[PDB]
Design an enzyme around this catalytic site. Structure first.
Site, PDB file in Angstrom:
ATOM      1  N   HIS A  41       0.843  -1.212  -0.092  1.00 40.62           N
ATOM      2  CA  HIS A  41       0.224  -0.087  -0.016  1.00 40.62           C
ATOM      3  C   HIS A  41       0.842   1.298   0.023  1.00 40.62           C
ATOM      4  O   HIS A  41       0.400   2.034  -0.434  1.00 40.62           O
ATOM      5  CB  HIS A  41      -0.907   0.062   1.156  1.00 40.62           C
ATOM      6  N   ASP A  90      -0.428  -7.470   1.385  1.00 39.70           N
ATOM      7  CA  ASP A  90       0.138  -5.899   1.362  1.00 39.70           C
ATOM      8  C   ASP A  90       1.694  -6.018   1.853  1.00 39.70           C
ATOM      9  O   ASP A  90       1.930  -5.888   2.820  1.00 39.70           O
ATOM     10  CB  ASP A  90      -0.415  -5.342   2.587  1.00 39.70           C
ATOM     11  N   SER A 186       3.609   1.862   8.340  1.00 41.92           N
ATOM     12  CA  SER A 186       3.190   1.189   7.339  1.00 41.92           C
ATOM     13  C   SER A 186       4.558   0.425   6.745  1.00 41.92           C
ATOM     14  O   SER A 186       5.524   1.208   6.457  1.00 41.92           O
ATOM     15  CB  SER A 186       2.574   2.038   6.145  1.00 41.92           C
ATOM     16  N   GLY A 187       4.506  -0.716   6.371  1.00 41.91           N
ATOM     17  CA  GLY A 187       5.774  -1.509   5.977  1.00 41.91           C
ATOM     18  C   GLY A 187       6.898  -1.801   6.676  1.00 41.91           C
ATOM     19  O   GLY A 187       7.657  -2.664   6.575  1.00 41.91           O
TER      20      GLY A 187
HETATM   21  C1  LIG Z   1      -9.503   3.595  10.223  1.00 46.43           C
HETATM   22  C2  LIG Z   1      -8.505   4.795  10.037  1.00 46.43           C
HETATM   23  C3  LIG Z   1      -8.640   4.922   8.371  1.00 46.43           C
HETATM   24  N1  LIG Z   1      -7.208   4.363  10.553  1.00 46.43           N
HETATM   25  S1  LIG Z   1      -5.723   5.043  10.263  1.00 46.43           S
HETATM   26  O1  LIG Z   1      -5.592   5.801  11.514  1.00 46.43           O
HETATM   27  O2  LIG Z   1      -5.901   5.955   9.290  1.00 46.43           O
HETATM   28  C4  LIG Z   1      -4.568   3.791  10.246  1.00 46.43           C
HETATM   29  C5  LIG Z   1      -3.645   4.142   9.232  1.00 46.43           C
HETATM   30  C6  LIG Z   1      -2.500   3.413   9.026  1.00 46.43           C
HETATM   31  C7  LIG Z   1      -2.284   2.130   9.680  1.00 46.43           C
HETATM   32  C8  LIG Z   1      -1.221   1.267   9.544  1.00 46.43           C
HETATM   33 CL1  LIG Z   1       0.047   1.534   8.403  1.00 46.43          CL
HETATM   34  C9  LIG Z   1      -0.948   0.229  10.491  1.00 46.43           C
HETATM   35  N2  LIG Z   1      -1.856   0.100  11.425  1.00 46.43           N
HETATM   36  C10 LIG Z   1      -2.855   0.868  11.644  1.00 46.43           C
HETATM   37  N3  LIG Z   1      -3.689   0.457  12.649  1.00 46.43           N
HETATM   38  C11 LIG Z   1      -3.668  -0.152  13.880  1.00 46.43           C
HETATM   39  N4  LIG Z   1      -4.644  -0.359  14.617  1.00 46.43           N
HETATM   40  N5  LIG Z   1      -2.333  -0.808  13.976  1.00 46.43           N
HETATM   41  C12 LIG Z   1      -3.153   1.981  10.691  1.00 46.43           C
HETATM   42  C13 LIG Z   1      -4.227   2.805  11.076  1.00 46.43           C
HETATM   43  C14 LIG Z   1      -8.742   6.039  10.679  1.00 46.43           C
HETATM   44  O3  LIG Z   1      -8.587   7.229  10.572  1.00 46.43           O
HETATM   45  O4  LIG Z   1     -10.036   6.047  11.542  1.00 46.43           O
END
Ligand SMILES: CC(C)(NS(=O)(=O)c1ccc2c(Cl)cnc(NC(=N)N)c2c1)C(=O)O
Ligand SMILES: *[C@@H]1O[C@H](CO)[C@@H](O)[C@H](O)[C@H]1NC(C)=O
Ligand SMILES: [Ca+2]
Lengths: 242, 128
Positions: A41, A90, A186-187
């Site tokens: 992603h 992913d 991420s990643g």
């Molecule tokens: C629902 C949404 C869109 N989530 S997020 O905040 O944008 C987000 C973005 C990246 C993540 C990553 Cl890369 C890894 N892990 C996550 N979550 C976790 N519980 N470990 C993440 C959460 C919001 O904004 O409500």
């Protein structure tokens, strides 16, 4: 990384900050001097081209990632069966033009081997320069947190992620929340210790919110992707052999 | 889902047999594997349709470098030593000095050890 702590030099020598337009976008895990495991992603169009990406290894602070310390990415390989919507598979691979010089600050993580016999709630570690709070901003210092693996059966409960965790996905964190991965991790590495060796068990993929109860971190199962990783690395070695 | 898939389906006796049968070569490029937290070197047997530990017998570092090359680590090589097999294996892959396809099936290992191949010095942080 929510709920974690500032990482120490050499604590996560595999952790890499991947940059686009002079800002951190994603984490990565050095598995070889030239190969980095990141999330698919992260490199979705328009960031599918290697030129946008520069890698920073052994630097804990985003402000210390200066012009000249970056490693330009030469090749981005997204998993062929990556789904942008379910975010299944992913996992992506980033090759570096310049091989990384391994030291105590920059070192590879071991790719997971079949038969790790990990615990259902295996203590794992998640590192990254991601948000220290949900909807929060990219962290300056590399952070890390202890997370436990959540068995996919428990993570696929209707009260958690409701059958959205694929076999190419593994869950880690705490069902109470408080400690999770977030925006910008991420990643990044979901790594565990076993046999005095750190093993890349997952790459930070997704999750609902950050550190929310019953909303843990979902990671791409690097074990399922090892064959693809080995094939892509071997093919690159064969191609540049010429 | 009757034999082995290439993403084309292959008869598992043609998987890892030395002849590249999938158009992407998937049947012949993932035939060497490290197993367990001790990097037990394993080779897939086309005949037994199973992954088998490589015996340390007459195994040198160039065979490890070759298995490492065949796993995508190229010129990366860290360690190849013999260890007791913890993979719960009963059949083993021994070397006929006369990577994969250069081995044969044996149910014992004269050294009593299997190959623990470490292609890259990884997995070590500041704290042992
Ligand atoms: C629902 C949404 C869109 N989530 S997020 O905040 O944008 C987000 C973005 C990246 C993540 C990553 Cl890369 C890894 N892990 C996550 N979550 C976790 N519980 N470990 C993440 C959460 C919001 O904004 O409500
Ligand atoms: C080794 O190969 C040769 C023939 O290629 C032969 O001596 C023998 O059949 C092989 N070894 C074993 C024990 O399989
Ligand atoms: Ca074949």
């Amino acid at each position: 990384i929510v709920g974690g702590e500032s990482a120490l030099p050499g604590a996560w020598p595999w952790q890499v900050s991947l940059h686009v337009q002079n800002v951190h976008v994603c984490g990565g895990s050095i598995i070889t001097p030239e190969w980095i495991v990141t999330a698919a992603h992260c490199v979705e169009k328009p960031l599918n081209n290697p030129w946008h990406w520069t890698a920073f290894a052994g630097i804990l602070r985003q402000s210390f990632m200066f012009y000249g310390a970056g490693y330009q990415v030469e090749k981005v390989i997204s998993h062929p069966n990556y789904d942008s919507k379910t975010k299944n598979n992913d996992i992506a691979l980033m090759k570096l033009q310049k091989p990384l010089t391994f030291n105590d600050l920059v070192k590879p993580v071991c790719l997971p081997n079949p038969g790790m016999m990990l615990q259902p709630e295996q203590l794992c570690w998640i590192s990254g320069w991601g948000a220290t709070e949900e909807k929060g901003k990219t962290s300056e210092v590399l952070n890390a947190a202890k997370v436990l693996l959540i068995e996919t059966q428990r993570c696929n409960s209707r009260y958690v992620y409701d059958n959205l965790i694929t076999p190419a996905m593994i869950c880690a964190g705490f069902l109470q929340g408080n400690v999770d991965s977030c925006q910008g991790d991420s990643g990044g590495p979901l790594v565990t210790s076993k046999n005095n060796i750190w093993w890349l068990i997952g790459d930070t993929s997704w999750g609902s919110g950050c550190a929310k109860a019953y909303r843990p971190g979902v990671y791409g199962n690097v074990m399922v992707f090892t064959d693809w990783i080995y094939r892509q690395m071997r093919a690159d070695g064969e191609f540049v052999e010429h | 889902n009757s034999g082995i898939e290439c993403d084309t389906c292959i008869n598992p006796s043609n998987w890892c047999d030395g002849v590249s049968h999938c158009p992407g070569g998937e049947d012949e490029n993932r035939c060497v594997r490290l197993y367990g937290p001790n990097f037990i070197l394993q080779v897939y047997s086309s005949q037994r349709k199973s992954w088998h530990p490589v015996c340390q017998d007459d195994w040198n570092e160039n065979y490890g470098r070759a298995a490492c090359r065949d796993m995508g680590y190229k010129n990366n090589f860290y360690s190849s030593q013999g260890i007791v097999d913890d993979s719960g294996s009963t059949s083993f892959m021994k070397l006929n000095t006369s990577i994969y396809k250069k081995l044969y099936h044996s149910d014992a290992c004269s050294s009593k050890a299997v190959v623990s191949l470490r292609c890259i010095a990884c997995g070590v942080n500041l704290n042992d």
